[PDB]
């Protein structure tokens, strides 16, 4: 089984805003990765082991809109640059990688999966560099090992002249450390 | 919803075609030099490579292109006309062995289908099954490079 992915927009600009203010989202949830937004920006949130994780630089300290009103974050780690809320009812969680593979695949907000070679604990190089505009909105998305397990979450692009050659990510290890603190 | 793989057929038989980089590719031994049908009439092939057993027409409607592989993995996955996925171990430039041999009937009608890498990117097109006594243990395939070069 190869890694394939698809995206589906579930909500528009004006409905997003109202939902942001009310904090009550009645839409049905499906999937492992949620496309997420604030009046400021849009990025991704990945469900791993019952917890919906994302970048602190994106969600800040905000609540996530749910069918029962706003939901406070379960974990927040300004230093690890992570925040996590209970995974929405309906979503599916990924499980952390255990195979220790160094060949990773980043899933972008456009549901494209691009190969990245692990060059360290929090870095990996794009086998095929793409312009940063392409990676825009993918912060918080998952870096999967060949078996489809969470190795890390996309955090920042390593670019020059507007082209990203590597990616900086939050290894799944920092998640456990964050839940422990 | 758009598909990367088209299940196509001539008067003689059925097989598959895969859209890679804006072109709908398939096996010359299945399509020959035929045109592909469209609501505005028959459209001719853009590429005909009898030697590499490759033909290509402009991608049809309701299709979406597949990205060519660039991670060089050897863990391939053949997709059949029934949407079955078969893990294949790449043995060479254009050969691979099924991880679990299957009856030839199982791979019947899938030529032209894609051989995908762990990222779902096109590694090549399924050319022919290599069988022994009606059991497919391996497959022949046209590497994406051939396609990329033909263009």
């Amino acid at each position: 089984a190869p890694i394939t992915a698809y995206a589906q927009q579930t909500r528009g600009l004006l409905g997003c805003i109202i939902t942001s203010l009310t904090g009550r989202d009645k839409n049905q949830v499906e999937g492992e990765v949620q496309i997420v937004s604030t009046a400021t920006q849009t990025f991704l949130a990945t469900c791993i082991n019952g917890v919906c994780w994302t970048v602190y630089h994106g969600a800040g300290t905000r609540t996530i809109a749910s069918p029962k009103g706003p939901v406070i974050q379960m974990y927040t780690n300004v230093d690890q640059d992570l925040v996590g809320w209970p995974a929405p009812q309906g979503s599916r969680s990924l499980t952390p990688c255990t195979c220790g593979s160094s060949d990773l695949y980043l899933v972008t907000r456009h549901a494209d999966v691009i190969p990245v070679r692990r060059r360290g604990d929090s870095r990996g190089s794009l086998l095929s560099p793409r312009p940063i505009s392409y990676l825009k909105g993918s912060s918080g998305g998952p870096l999967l090992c060949p078996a489809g397990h969470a190795v890390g979450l996309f955090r920042a692009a390593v670019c020059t002249r507007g082209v990203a050659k590597a990616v900086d990510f939050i290894p799944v290890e920092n998640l456990e450390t964050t839940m422990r603190s | 919803v758009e598909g990367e793989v088209q299940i196509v057929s001539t008067a003689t038989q059925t097989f598959l075609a895969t859209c890679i980089n804006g072109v709908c590719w398939t096996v010359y031994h299945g399509a020959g030099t035929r045109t592909i049908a469209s609501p505005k009439g028959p459209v001719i092939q853009m590429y005909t490579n009898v030697d590499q057993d490759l033909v290509g027409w402009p991608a049809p409607q309701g299709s979406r292109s597949l990205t060519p592989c660039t991670c060089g993995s050897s863990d391939l996955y053949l997709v059949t006309r029934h949407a079955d996925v078969i893990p294949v171990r790449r043995r060479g430039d254009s050969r691979g062995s099924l991880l679990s041999p299957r009856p030839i009937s199982y791979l019947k009608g899938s030529s032209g289908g894609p051989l995908l890498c762990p990222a779902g990117h096109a590694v090549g097109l399924f050319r022919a099954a290599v069988c022994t006594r009606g059991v497919a243990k391996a497959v022949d395939f046209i590497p994406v490079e051939n396609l990329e070069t033909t263009m």
Binding site: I35, V36, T63, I64 | -
Partner: peptide, 22 residues
Amino acid sequence: KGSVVIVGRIVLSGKPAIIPKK
């Protein structure tokens, strides 16, 4: 501030499928 809102989803659990004709 406002809540973070889910505006879409990315599904990884889907497997190849023959598109049903309507």
